[PDB]
């Protein structure tokens, strides 16, 4: 009979009285409006907000609290994501503003650093294959398809960017631990965020690591995104690292389109990834820095805020950029270079004169 | 989205903690089983049990608490009705037992009564036109169709059983009151049972009374059933009353089938009516009796139970038969005749010697 | 087979030849147009107009004659309701005009009355929970859900507006009668209007009364609407009564949205209720007045019409406002205050000089 | 399997190589376009054109060659009917032009004729009840419903226009023949045109004739349309005939809307009837005329064409108007009056001087 | 909305109060049961019974009154046809009994007649192509397909049974009349039975006559069935006529199956045709006889009944067999031969001694 009554959407509304951006930007009207929508692959709003709902989030710590199951999610649930995307990326408006992508290593300047605290340099991005559900919603078949596509493409790389693909299922635990310690691998997700998002399913099936012979170019397959590209260099020649990064990414993309596959990408958001915080470009060019001359400073938190830098624990700190949506890859790399140059120029403990220089 | 959850059937289960036969024979399993069924016309279980649920029923008073929206109901909701029908009709089992219908006025004997307390004699039955929803569920169009069919059929009656059809909408209030007082009309339903059953809808549209010239043969159209046939006689010659009743009913049925209409009827239940208490034949042959020599008796209620008689208030009492399902019309009339003959014979106040004679 | 023919809509058209606003504003074209529409929950036009069709209405008495089964009704059947709403609320046009709601007790002035005939003061409004069918169409599950939501919300009230919820099913008949006499309860619906609308179903299941300790703030749950809020004061300090009313209503609404529920509300109509006469705000601020110095007046009905006041029997009269749609709550309260001030000022029997003062 | 192929629409195209307006205005493109459309009641193009296809039509005789099964037909198959309607009604364009209806008997003048050849006067129109399929497609139930509606409405007529309804099924053959001879009945359809359209189905069930006591106002029920209204007068006082016609038609329409029924009517076409030739108003005001002074004239057909008159065989000729769509009823009646006045003024055989006077 | 109510089937029941086998074997229960069924091609019960309903049938004349729209009709509507088939074919029971078909011309004996009244001899049968709707329901495309199949098949005939196909649309009226007079053509259907059955649609499109050079073997395409085969001989050598008939029929069937087409045929009924009277074999072997020595006999109708013969008007009488279902073709031919031999043997007017000899 059609006279049976459904649960009112308000009955399913989460209890967000002690939470922290989905919780603040989710309202009864929005949930009721989106309670019945769904992407063509079956993704639904509750699945998007499950990770945030499960984890209330510690005070003073801002977490997005949602994920996307496929490309169509950002369109179907735009009314919810858009405020979150805007709040995350310091005012960027997905509805109106547009994103531009450039990967030219000629524009960059400076590049060379000073071997004082740079230690190492790295650049990282993510890429999702179109037509395949994202890790939060991907099934075993889709995950295996992503792995096959990426592996077959990378097999065609020639020259310096030529290496091998190692499957987690076929790798010894000791070797995996050694690679993790050497910063050349990813660990099994254990924090509540990933598992609540449902991205540790079927571990370690269909997760792998492709790295070049020199180990200066790595690609994680099915860890947080369909592909996570990394260009590393145990030094401070960010120019060369970014050059290798962009050229290898271009070659990988060319090989992807050769077989008929395309990276998810649209003008409003750019490259599409799971975490809305990683939308835009996904670039996280950064470096490692030392504790002594820097830890005992006066007000570096304000300095980092002024120069748009993100400081986190190594694994001595790690300094990178904050926002990926909006600015372009070359812009973000230049910003990081200028910020680290300022940091290593005004680090002087021999004298004083820190200027911040917003 | 198909992920939304319906209200569990147990959520809709009525609160029958202070009720009296649907309440005792309705259980969570039955409601859950039938919570989704429905007759082809859209009748549902909640509609069937609404009248009983609304009225808890006074203690010591047994009411069915149920109705049917059409014929298919008794099939669709048989798992629920059948215990109620069996409990009502003192053990009759609809599932196994079968019903037989006869209307021969030759079989009856005796007939003539004594003008002591008989006063008046009456016989009543009900009939439902197949293909049309019953009064609880009938719409305006179906009610008008029932009225048209019945009126056109009765127009063809000739001879003694020839009279006129009076429409309630075209009848003065004073005339209606006079007819009601003369026991030749039906009043607007006001008791909670009928209104809760939803049978007072659109009153007085499409309700009428067809009566012969002598007013000894009446038919109420759309009051409690599609048709309520009555044969009256201000006397005690039950033989003649039943003869006229059966012959007129046969003629009316013949005229009904002439135009292609059929009375609802199936072997298990016989003629189909709204109240499950009226199933079977609907016959309620009875008479009116006096107070003085009778009310002051010793244990008449036991006598009535023993002889299978129903005593109610006139409008001095009214005595008739109890059960309609099972026994046949001739059987019920003979039982009533024998019971009233016993009552009048063993009414002796001049002496004693009541024998009950179960 | 698809060759079977449906009943033409004109066949179902009611017989309104002796009725009084649905009958005047219902025409064959409108019924034919809306004969097949239905709200997503299954509400249909015939259900809306059943209450008016059953009750022809006494001459010179204006009754709306229709009800709404849910919010979408006012949209789906707008072509029928809109003329009715406009005729009821003295020219307000739902299609074009818009409604504004304010609940500020600072704007009100005067407030204090004279203890001559004021006796008592009261304010009343209604509120419907979104996502749940209205009482005319609500099922048992939806009614229980409404009761649970309201009770859980009111449990969070603290301070002066803190009290208890009493369930009808768990309340003695004598206590209920005493509360009714004290004007602190609602009686079981018995008028034909209520029952024909199907709002007495399942009585008294899921009907309750929540009142504060001082009994100056009451809330009827599932009597005529999902919630009926009342603020009472056995005096004439309308200012304080309205202050308590608005602050308590704001707190109740806040607690409602805390759990994810929202009151039905749209700009064109404001708060959505069953009777179209109660649309807009539902406010009926009024007072009780005495008979002697007032009943024997010259042309008080003209005075009430001029000052936009409604006078009805107590249970000495009750004087309040007429229209709720259009004017705002503060506006209506101020109008009532000014009207009663005029009445108690121009009540002079010591002398004459009534001015009406349209 | 869905791989099976339907017959191409061109396969069903009729063989119209020796036909006469459907054949000229039906083309392969139109048939292919409309080969799959259908009115909600199931009417299809082939049904519309069946009557024209079966009857090739004699040369020099123009017949419409199509009919409509219901109102929606004229909308659904407008691409085919519209050229036919325009060609029939001498240039009227249904798509752009609009129709206006008036029935005032005050506007008419003259009226009185000369008892030379007028003999008798008559006016005729047709009317279709909305919501019921037209005779070509109506089933038995719909035909009976039309008859019931018309009979119940006409029962309410009072005064001069009060009479009786006679059913064909209950009328003797001799009486029917006498009525036909007296021009007070219709004969069983036998022409191939009628039967090919399927309008003689179930004869004589549900066909009747309602006529007033004076027999000056007749109504044929279910002969060519749902209703055919006729006002007759064995004389030449066309003014009185038209007055009675219009007033009786107004009363009948009022009684129709009283019960909730409406005549089919839309601005573009006016009153909707089966034959597209009868669209617009259906008025055929005319008279009977004699042979001698008129037949042996010079160029009578030219005079009729110039004056917009239609001359046909009585059952001495019968002269009326040609077009119904476009001009209004009063306009058509005035045109007929002027034409007959001119005919009876220029009929002079005593002398010559015919002027035609286009 | 799904709350709208269909017309009850009893509303559509025909008015058969003055009819004659469908009318007697159609009852309200059967019509109600079959009111919604339909063959896969859309044939419905009302279409089947339309021909009988329209024509009441003269008293003392038995007509089947129904037709079939396709092969599946006899199965879908078996509950109605089966009593009619049984009543028509003197007790044959389609449900239980089975039909056997033989066409061997060796079994027949006698054959040669006496040139006294035989005059001419003829044999006729019908055949329907499987997968194509029967003439009552066939569209233009299906009719053209039947014509194409039959013509292409007959083109392959060689030897004595070689001739030409003449299309009605391409044949002069005078030639058609001459062929009709010579008993070598069929006339345009005009009887009410045919037109009511809807088998004169689109005349003369797709109707033809294929005849051999000697004109002793004819085939009517799309006149009453898809194919009507006839073998004629202006004499009395029934043996040769039947031999040619059976051999030509076998050759035609072989050519039909060559292209992948099959004659409709099932064991219960045999060859499937429109009129249920023609079911079984369709054989009507007969002869023409003279008036003088035969008309003036004593009890010829009794003789015809006893010998199972049918006498009808020529176009002097025509005598053939009565029943086709049951007995086989050879059986029917032998019965006709024996009956005519008896007739021409006991025709003696020179003396008496008629024996009837049931
Ligand atoms: N500049 C760097 N130099 C060396 N190792 C790095 C650098 N940046 C990141 N890593 C390594 O990457 C690993 C994971 O980094 P993570 O916090 O997941 O970055 P992301 O989230 O951008 O992938 C760590 O074990 C860390 O050692
Ligand atoms: N034997 C009788 N004599 C006279 N009137 C009777 C008799 N039986 C019933 N009636 C009349 O029938 C009316 C309604 O009876 P009711 O209780 O409705 O019987 P039922 O329910 O079987 O129709 C009463 O007003 C009563 O006067
Ligand atoms: N100003 C008032 N003072 C005291 N009691 C009141 C006042 N207004 C209403 N009531 C009480 O409310 C009860 C029901 O009122 P009702 O007519 O239903 O108003 P509404 O329809 O607006 O709820 C009555 O029993 C009456 O005593
Ligand atoms: N002016 C008239 N006077 C008398 N009888 C008339 C007149 N006009 C029509 N009739 C009668 O109407 C009958 C049918 O007319 P018909 O040709 O069907 O007109 P329509 O098609 O407009 O109904 C005829 O038998 C004829 O006698
Ligand atoms: N034995 C026969 N000899 C000559 N012509 C015949 C004979 N039988 C039938 N016909 C011709 O067949 C034509 C139509 O016959 P019909 O009554 O339609 O038979 P059926 O219905 O079996 O086809 C008639 O014109 C008739 O002349
Ligand atoms: C930013 C990110 O990678 N996130 C967002 C974070 C959250 N819900 O706030 O949790 C998860 C879980 C799994 C994968 C990615 C993230
Ligand atoms: C027996 C009868 O007519 N009933 C049953 C009774 C009940 N619910 O127990 O109430 C009603 C109401 C309406 C119509 C019939 C009955
Ligand atoms: C105005 C009101 O509260 N109404 C309207 C009234 C009518 N039909 O005119 O009937 C009912 C019935 C139940 C509840 C409310 C009302
Ligand atoms: C014009 C008219 O009344 N027609 C049209 C005519 C045709 N097909 O040309 O056929 C029929 C048949 C029945 C009723 C009316 C008409
Ligand atoms: C027997 C026969 O050929 N029939 C049956 C007859 C009837 N309805 O009784 O009518 C028709 C019409 C058309 C073709 C065949 C028959």
Curated annotation (Swiss-Prot), chains A, B, C, D, E:
Enumerate the InterPro entries for this protein: ATP-guanido_PTrfase, ATP-guanido_PTrfase_AS, ATP-guanido_PTrfase_cat, ATP-guanido_PTrfase_N, ATP-guanido_PTrfase_N_sf, Gln_synth/guanido_kin_cat_dom
Give UniProt keywords alphabetically. ATP-binding, Kinase, Membrane, Mitochondrion, Mitochondrion inner membrane, Nucleotide-binding, Phosphoprotein, Transferase, Transit peptide
Membrane topology, as annotated: Peripheral membrane protein
Give its localization. Mitochondrion inner membrane
Listed under catalytic activity are: creatine + ATP = N-phosphocreatine + ADP + H(+)
Q: Which GO terms describe its molecular function?
A: ATP binding; creatine kinase activity
Residue(s) carrying Phosphoserine? 110, 155, 191
Q: Which residues bind ATP?
A: 120-124, 183, 228, 284, 312-315, 318
Q: Which GO terms describe its cellular component?
A: mitochondrial inner membrane; mitochondrion
Q: Please report the stretch or stretches of sequence annotated as the Phosphagen kinase N-terminal domain.
A: 5-90
SUPFAM superfamilies, A to Z: Glutamine synthetase/guanido kinase (SSF55931), Guanido kinase N-terminal domain (SSF48034)
Report the PROSITE patterns cross-referenced here: PHOSPHAGEN_KINASE, PHOSPHAGEN_KINASE_C, PHOSPHAGEN_KINASE_N
Modification type Phosphothreonine: residues: 172, 314
Q: State one Pfam family annotation.
A: ATP-gua_PtransN
Sorted alphabetically, which Gene3D superfamilies does this protein's record hold? ATP:guanido phosphotransferase, N-terminal domain, Glutamine synthetase/guanido kinase, catalytic domain
UniProt-annotated stretches for the region Cardiolipin-binding? 1-23
Span of domain Phosphagen kinase C-terminal: 117-350
Protein task: Reversibly catalyzes the transfer of phosphate between ATP and various phosphogens (e.g. creatine phosphate). Creatine kinase isoenzymes play a central role in energy transduction in tissues with large, fluctuating energy demands, such as skeletal muscle, heart, brain and spermatozoa.
Q: How does it assemble?
A: Exists as an octamer composed of four MTCK homodimers.
Q: What else is known?
A: Mitochondrial creatine kinase binds cardiolipin.
* Family affiliation: Belongs to the ATP:guanido phosphotransferase family.
User: What protein name does the entry list?
Assistant: Creatine kinase U-type, mitochondrial
Which organism encodes this protein? Answer: Homo sapiens
